[PDB]
Amino acid sequence: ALRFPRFSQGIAQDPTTRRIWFGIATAHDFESHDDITEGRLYQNIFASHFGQLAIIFLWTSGNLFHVAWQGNFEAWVQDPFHVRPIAHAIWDPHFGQPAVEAFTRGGALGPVNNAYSGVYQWWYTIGLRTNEDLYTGAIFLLFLSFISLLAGWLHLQPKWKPSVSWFKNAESRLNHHLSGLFGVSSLAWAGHLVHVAIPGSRGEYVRWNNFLDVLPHPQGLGPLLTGQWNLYAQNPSSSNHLFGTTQGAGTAILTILGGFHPQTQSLWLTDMAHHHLAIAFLFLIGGHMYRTNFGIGHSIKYILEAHIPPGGRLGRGHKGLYDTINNSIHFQLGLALASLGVITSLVAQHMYSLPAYAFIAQDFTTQAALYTHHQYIAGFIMTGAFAHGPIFFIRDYNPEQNADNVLARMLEHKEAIISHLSWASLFLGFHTLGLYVHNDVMLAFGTPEKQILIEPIFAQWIQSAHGKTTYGFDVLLSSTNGPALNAGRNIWLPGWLNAINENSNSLFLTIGPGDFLVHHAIALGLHTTTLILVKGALDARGSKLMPDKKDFGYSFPCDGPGRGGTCDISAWDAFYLAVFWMLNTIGWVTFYWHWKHITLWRGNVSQFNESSTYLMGWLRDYLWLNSSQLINGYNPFGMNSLSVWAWMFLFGHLVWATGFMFLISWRGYWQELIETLAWAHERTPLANLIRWRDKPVALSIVQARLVGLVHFSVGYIFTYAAFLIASTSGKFG
């Protein structure tokens, strides 16, 4: 290539504007660049990972730096209940005086924004107390950023370039990551909790300059090597302990108490320390499984190759999977993203119900922000997992080398899989929509008693088995004579059962028919999105309408108007369609979470319980109500600190609709229009003197789909974020 993009002369020889766009859009798809090899691929990916790490460290250091420099962290640690955490100061020369006055919150001497990332609760819980601590941490993470960049640059150099064989050493990387990255890190974090966090919560200032001079335990290190570990759990913090103070503080460092610290309404630091320690041990033991350079250990290839059931109901089983995974980075990225997405949702679900940060969960807006954040992140990550799924199926999958294994057999009965997903989605849709519409009609005709309200018996039963006594099923942990109850009666069950039956927190909230309905909506969402994604993955290589689709790649416009028409036939297009359904699904889940929790914090769950049974209830009592303050951020009379969220609300609506533009109108119209504009320019005097170097053309079909989807998603996210934050913080529950 003689011009941008240098990695593709095909695009470089494009005389049009496309050349630029695609240049930007294919910059990270290394596999499709000119003169690339496996080596360059892995090496560039490695360096790119270092770059990403550097960006993360720099980002975190930025957060720490700004909280320390412009925030009220100290004022917050002195009074976490009645201080709004400052994210950063704001200097906008576009501001008028009312704007300056309105945005001066907290103890600030000027306009600021209130943090809803919850970094205050986190940092305070783990041991940070002063601005100086934050500054030192910022400097350290900046140092880590520089180090990571240096490492990328280094390993890019010919002396430090790793071979492809090294990248394909799976057993070693698994051993090291399980034992070191997972194990040693968790053990070391337990170390931080024991040495810094726990003493900090007990009112003991422990830093680098004295941590060697202070005992983490009255009789430290003895009981560990003695085997008298129980001594580390002797006297935990009292039930009247005040966080950050010596009052009510114990001396234990490792416990399994369960439940929440009553003041902070979060998990016990000793519980978390013991947790991280234990899992550190499971990781460390589990990290010595695979064979390396010492003559012992397992061979993953052999393990896979051995797991084939006699009788052949799974064909050749897992024979050959080792190579087809270890050779295909896309398969690896698919597995990675799938797992990561699952545990991201897990993070949301566990962090809302079992908060681990002191004086979070009292901060309602922060909780909502966090849940929505992680659920949308999880959604996108999932769609991506299912996107690198079929890229594997197209770019990497070798049919012959996978003969009759679980994967090839998977492609065999694809119609069965897809058709059954279709049935599930169809059923759930028909009946959930049907029941909702039924109930709405009943409410309309003034007869809500005729509503079909199905009780969530199964989930309620699970809650009862977990020790909740609201439904009175009296099972397992709810049954006084149950062996499961007697087993841990004197360990975690006191605190746990105390927490699960305290109906002011989010630990196993009480559920009714509304919960049933919306849960089935969620089921519909999951099943349908997976229908799109799975169907797109399995038909990525071909279908009866296009048997040679694999010869065209992951992304292409279409195959033409022939054979009936082939719009949106590529696997990429399947992804693109699936994104709408993910946004819809997560929309429903976040709507659910937020409404239920707002009604919880407001003190009237009956609102949700009665109104969520019909869609007019969601529209009127959730959407329409909670926008009152939001839309009044600015008006003909004046403005307040919510003007940002109103402006952002409208911003989101606008971007969303522009998305509609790119999604509804297609290329040819615009191409011809642009032709008339080109004529116009070449025939306009004075302007004639100026000419373009890249011929103006309409965006491509796929490009249009992408840009449209991007406007749509951005609008979606920004709109809901503005509503979430404004509605919640406008009243703070």
Partner: peptide
């Protein structure tokens, strides 16, 4: 408030001008 009056117009006006000009020349070459 002192530094922001320096850094904000720096990052909001100067930086994107320099970057856009540079990228323009780079892409046009």
């Amino acid at each position: 408030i002192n530094l922001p009056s320096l850094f904000v117009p720096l990052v909001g006006l100067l930086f994107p001008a320099v970057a856009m000009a540079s990228l323009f020349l780079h892409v046009e070459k």
